[PDB]
Design an enzyme around this catalytic site. Sequence first.
Site: not given
Lengths: 371, 379
Positions: B28, B32, B95, B105, B321-322
Site C-alpha cells: 500500500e 503511494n 490513475y 494508502g 470490491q475484489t
Amino acid sequence: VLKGLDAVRKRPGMYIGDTDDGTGLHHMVFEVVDNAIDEALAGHCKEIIVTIHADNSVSVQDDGRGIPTGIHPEEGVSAAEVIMTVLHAGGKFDDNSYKVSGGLHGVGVSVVNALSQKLELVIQREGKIHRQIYEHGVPQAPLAVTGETEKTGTMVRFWPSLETFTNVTEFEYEILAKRLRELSFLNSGVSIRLRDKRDGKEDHFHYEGGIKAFVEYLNKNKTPIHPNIFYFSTEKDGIGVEVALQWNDGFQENIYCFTNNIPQRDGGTHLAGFRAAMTRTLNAYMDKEGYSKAREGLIAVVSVKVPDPKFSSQTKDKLVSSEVKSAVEQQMNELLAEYLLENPTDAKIVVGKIIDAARAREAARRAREMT
Amino acid sequence: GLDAVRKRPGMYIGDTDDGTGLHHMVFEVVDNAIDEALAGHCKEIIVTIHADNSVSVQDDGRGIPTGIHPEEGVSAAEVIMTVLHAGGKFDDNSYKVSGGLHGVGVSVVNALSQKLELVIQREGKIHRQIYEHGVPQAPLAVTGETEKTGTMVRFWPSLETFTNVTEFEYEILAKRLRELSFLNSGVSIRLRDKRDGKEDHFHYEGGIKAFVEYLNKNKTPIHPNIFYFSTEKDGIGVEVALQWNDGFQENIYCFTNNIPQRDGGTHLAGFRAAMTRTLNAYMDKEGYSKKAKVSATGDDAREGLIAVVSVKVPDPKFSSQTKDKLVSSEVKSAVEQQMNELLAEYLLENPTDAKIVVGKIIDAARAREAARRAREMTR
Ligand SMILES: [Cl-]
Ligand SMILES: [Cl-]
Ligand SMILES: [K+]
Ligand SMILES: [K+]
Ligand SMILES: [K+]
Ligand code: NA
C-alpha cells in the site's frame, strides 16, 4: 503593506520607462507579454493573443496553466492576487531561471496593475473560470469562480491610468507588431496574434524556424549575395543558442544580439563568442582552401536562452555571462565549419566578398598616400 | 478518522492472522510511492526490511506536502496520514486507484502501525513526524536541511492487530516488487534485508517484454520474436507482450494500474478480439482452408500462449470490491484497436514466427478433434 504599488505610482518611469513619450505605455503591454511567453520555454504556453480595444485598453490572452488560484495561507488571498498586489511576489514565486525579473525592470503584471486605472484578470484553471477586477491596483472583490471551462490559461486586460500616462495615451499598432514579431522569431513554435478592435487589423506571428525567418526579414530589402542562410538552434548545458547569418551586397555590419528575448545594444559574451568562432572558422577555411594571408555586408542574429543571465548594468545592453562565450563559440565553430564544406557555392561567394573588401580597404588607404 | 480502520482492520488490508494483510501494508505504501513515477517525479523506490520487523519505503519523489492545511491547522502530510480518504482527495492524479476499503494508502498503514516514522525531504529541508497507532506525537517539524527531495515511511505493524505472522518474508516482497518494476518500466525498485544483508534491484527499460521472458524462462518458446508494444492513446496506457511455447496451457496475466485481474475483464476481451481478427485476416491472406480458419477461431483457448496485458486507466471500474474483473468498457476498445494494428504489423514483419504460431494453433485443434473422434470410435 510593506510590499506594495505606492513605490511604482510615485516613480513610474523607473519601472516601465517615460510615461510622457509613449515608451512606458507600450512597455506596459510587453511586461504582460513577457509574463505570458516565459511559460513557453517549458511547453506550457503555446499561443498568446494581444488585442488593442476601442477604449484604449489592451488585453493579453494565453493558453498556459493559468495563474495559481489557491489562497496563500499567510496573505489569506488567492495566489494570483498576491502576485498582482505584492510588487515582487511574481518574480519570487516563479522557479523559472530563464525569467529575468528584477527590482525595477521586468517586475511583471504588478507594475502594470499599479499604473492601470482598471485591470481585469480571467483565469481558466482546474476546469473553472476565475474572474477579478482591480482599480489602481486595489482588488474590487476576491478572485471568484464565475463558470466552468475545458481550457487553461490567463487573460489580463488593462486600462492605463491617465494620471500616470500623459501626451501619448493611445497604442500604436506598429510598436506592438514589430516587438511581437521579434518575440515569435526568437521563440520558434510560439504563436503570437495581434488584433486591433479600432479598425479590425490583425497579424499572426508563428515560425517553425524563427531564427532563419528573422534574417530573411532583415534581408528582404537587401540583396543577399549567397542563397543559403547559415543557421542553427542548439541546446547544451541549459544554454540554448540560435544563430542565423547571411551576407548582402552592402558594406555594413548588423549583428543583433539577444539574451532571453532582451536585446543587447552593446553586445557582450554572446557577440564575442560569435566573432571569435567566425574569425577562427573563416581563417581555417581560407588557410586550407589556399587564400593567402566588423565584416562588410554581414546580417546576423545571435539569440541565447541562458538561466539567470548577468549584464554589465541595469540597462541589460551588455551580456557579461562568461559561460555564454564558450556556449556560442563552440557550436558555431562546429556548425559553420560544416556549413562552409556543405555549401561550397555559398562559401566561395562569402570568401570572395571578404577578399575583395580587403583588396579595396588596403588600396583605399594606399590611394590616400598617393596624392 | 481512523477508529473505523482500527475496529475492522482486515476489511482494509486483508486478514491479519496469515501474513496477507501484514505484507499488503508494505505494498500500500509502495503504491503511494509508485504513483509519483508515471508523473515523472519519482525515479527510485528503496524498500528495506529492518531487524526489528519494521519496513521502510523511501522514494526520490517531490515529498508529501508540508504546508499547513488552512482548514485543518495541521500539515498537509498529517491530514493525509490521519484522515482516511484525505490522500485520494488531495491527489488530482486519476490513475491512483483509491477505494473505500482497499487501497486507501498510508492512512490505513498508519492506523494499523504501532509506530510510524515519516521523513519528508522537500523545499531544501528535512521534516519529521512520529505516529503511534495513528496518533501524531507532535506536529510535522523541520529537523535539518537537505539538497534532496523525497518521502520516507518506516512503519512497525501493531501486534494487537497482526497475529501468527509478524515477520516479513523477503520472497513475498521480492516477487511483487519485481512485477511492479515490469509493469512500470523505467522505475527502479531496490529491496534490502537488514537481517541478512540480502538485496535485489529491479529495473527494466522494457518491462512488458522482460515480464514475458521471465514467464517463459522454464518453458520452451516455439518462435524467437516476442510480440510486444507499449502505447498511450487518449489517456489509456496499453502494454502487451506475448510469446507461444511448446506447451498446451494458456496464461494471460491481466493488470489494471498494477492490480491483477484473476477473472479478466475488458482488457482480456479487447486482447482476445484483436488476436481473433488479426489471426483470421492473416489466415484469409495466407490461403488457409475454411476448416483451418474455424479450427483457429471457434473457441478462444490458445494452447502454448503466455501473455501479459497491463493497462493504465484514469479511474478504472471493477465488477466488485475484489478488483478481479475490469468492467471499464472503454479499455476493450483501447486494447483491441492498438493490438489489431500492431499485431498485424508483427505478423508481416516476422513471417517465420507467424507461420509457427498459426501452425501450432491449428495443430492443437486438429489433435483435440482427433482425440475426441478416437474417444467416439473406441469399443
Ligand atoms: Cl491564421
Ligand atoms: Cl546495482
Ligand atoms: K524566484
Ligand atoms: K541549418
Ligand atoms: K525576458
Ligand atoms: Na536591453
